[PDB]
Amino acid sequence: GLSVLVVCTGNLCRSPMAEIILRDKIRQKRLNIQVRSAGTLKTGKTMPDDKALQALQDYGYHPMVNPVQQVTQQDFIEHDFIYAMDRTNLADLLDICPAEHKNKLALFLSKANRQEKEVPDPYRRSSEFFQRTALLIESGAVALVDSWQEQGI
Amino acid sequence: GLSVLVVCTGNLCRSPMAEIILRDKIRQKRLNIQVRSAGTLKTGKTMPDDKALQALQDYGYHPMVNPVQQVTQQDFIEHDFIYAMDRTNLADLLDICPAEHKNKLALFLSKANRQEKEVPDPYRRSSEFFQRTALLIESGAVALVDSWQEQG
């Protein structure tokens, strides 16, 4: 029905938070949309960062979390849309995306309509930082889910 | 529908692995069932240990995992069944379950045709150990789902 990917540097913080927040909202409206996560940089890690997951249980998410992923050339073909958290994520994604698919790429907040266009980098920051981060990503999420709700007539 | 809870001591290793494998098998059997994990002991951690997550990948399980909870009185009334990995897990469980629900407890290996029916502690031993534990947990999960198909 629709396949969506979200990308950050390591797939530790922002893309999984994005992916979890996205799945809840897609689910609450029974939308045939699936979402994943993935990083640009490969990590030793297996699971998304703890601080990152605390911040989302504090807001009432009980998340079945997917293991860390780095982005793979099949993703540029598999997924109908690919969202970037900050533009450093979006450049690195473009140094690698087939020219046949650069049209899939857009930043996360792109549909927000807000002073925010990038999602800053929470890695190893205060828990309070992650609160705001979760909200920025949360707002970006509902815009998308409401947007997607529209193209279907 | 159905609810099943699998408990161990930390909810770091065994109850998590039991949680994935049941999902896989309930999937394969397209059954009206879902499963949770939970610890008995309190812990200030957020994700099951890695060595436990890999042991399922080696076996081709996608370890998409709920984070670590400790057991709460809510678990005794949300779920239909509760399973202990240890018998030590079963003492701790019985110390707190209301009298009208102790008929929900069982060991995890309850329906396995195997002699000893505890699932030992992978903490925090070699991956080969985690490999064994996975099959012991994997073996356990097969017998549960075959009964549930008729436990009615």
Side-chain angles (χ1 to χ4, degrees):
Chain A
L2 209 88
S3 181
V4 176
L5 224 188
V6 160
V7 192
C8 63
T9 307
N11 193 207
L12 303 185
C13 302
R14 317 181 230 112
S15 2
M17 299 187 231
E19 183 202 356
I20 288 140
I21 296 176
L22 274 166
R23 210 189 325 276
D24 202 75
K25 318 228 161 174
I26 283 153
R27 170 151 210 193
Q28 298 294 29
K29 289 167 181 312
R30 283 242 194 290
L31 297 176
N32 210 334
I33 299 192
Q34 292 253 73
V35 49
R36 305 282 183 253
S37 178
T40 78
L41 191 84
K42 180 111 269 164
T43 58
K45 271 115 241 236
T46 316
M47 286 286 144
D49 208 282
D50 287 333
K51 261 216 174 103
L53 272 302
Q54 318 167 153
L56 305 135
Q57 48 208 179
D58 299 4
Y59 291 4
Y61 294 100
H62 175 28
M64 255 175 316
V65 15
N66 280 138
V68 173
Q69 279 187 195
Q70 195 243 259
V71 68
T72 72
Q73 284 294 336
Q74 234 275 308
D75 293 326
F76 294 130
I77 324 172
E78 216 227 299
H79 295 298
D80 298 302
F81 303 106
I82 295 178
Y83 296 95
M85 299 298 95
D86 74 348
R87 70 159 161 77
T88 303
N89 293 340
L90 183 56
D92 293 0
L93 274 178
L94 273 177
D95 298 6
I96 262 102
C97 184
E100 316 83 304
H101 291 138
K102 301 184 160 221
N103 61 323
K104 277 135 156 224
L105 277 64
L107 278 172
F108 179 43
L109 301 182
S110 41
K111 294 262 108 157
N113 242 98
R114 306 176 66 259
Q115 180 162 345
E116 328 295 345
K117 289 290 156 177
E118 285 172 83
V119 174
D121 190 26
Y123 186 73
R124 236 143 123 165
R125 288 304 211 99
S126 66
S127 344
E128 304 84 46
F129 189 112
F130 281 78
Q131 277 153 255
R132 325 193 268 257
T133 309
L135 273 160
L136 177 48
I137 283 145
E138 192 175 330
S139 60
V142 322
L144 297 161
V145 184
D146 284 309
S147 168
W148 298 330
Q149 263 238 276
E150 283 323 307
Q151 21 256 23
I153 320 283
Chain B
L2 224 94
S3 237
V4 170
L5 166 59
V6 165
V7 189
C8 66
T9 296
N11 193 203
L12 303 187
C13 303
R14 306 178 291 250
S15 25
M17 309 185 221
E19 199 205 348
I20 306 144
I21 301 177
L22 278 167
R23 252 163 225 158
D24 185 277
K25 255 85 137 38
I26 300 296
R27 162 192 222 114
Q28 306 179 24
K29 244 74 175 88
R30 39 213 74 165
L31 271 192
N32 211 338
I33 312 182
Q34 235 141 294
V35 44
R36 315 275 182 149
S37 146
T40 53
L41 210 77
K42 285 119 183 181
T43 187
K45 276 173 157 163
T46 327
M47 290 300 148
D49 212 77
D50 290 322
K51 268 174 148 172
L53 290 151
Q54 318 166 349
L56 283 111
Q57 289 161 335
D58 310 4
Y59 291 10
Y61 291 104
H62 184 44
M64 123 116 146
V65 261
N66 288 131
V68 41
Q69 327 143 308
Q70 27 296 111
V71 60
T72 67
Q73 291 304 312
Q74 248 302 271
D75 293 323
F76 296 118
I77 174 64
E78 202 101 72
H79 306 300
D80 290 63
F81 310 92
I82 315 189
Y83 295 97
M85 294 269 132
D86 257 340
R87 61 158 145 75
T88 297
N89 291 347
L90 188 57
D92 291 2
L93 268 231
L94 281 161
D95 285 15
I96 61 181
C97 183
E100 14 124 55
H101 294 141
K102 279 165 154 155
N103 73 316
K104 288 172 169 176
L105 286 80
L107 270 170
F108 189 78
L109 302 174
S110 329
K111 303 196 148 126
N113 191 318
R114 320 192 8 115
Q115 202 150 301
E116 320 207 352
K117 310 219 167 218
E118 265 152 81
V119 184
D121 221 51
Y123 218 76
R124 26 217 138 126
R125 324 183 110 171
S126 74
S127 28
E128 266 64 40
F129 197 94
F130 277 87
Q131 240 121 214
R132 290 211 259 163
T133 313
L135 285 155
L136 190 48
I137 282 161
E138 192 194 330
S139 183
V142 192
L144 298 148
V145 294
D146 260 292
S147 239
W148 292 340
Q149 247 201 88
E150 286 293 342
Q151 276 291 39

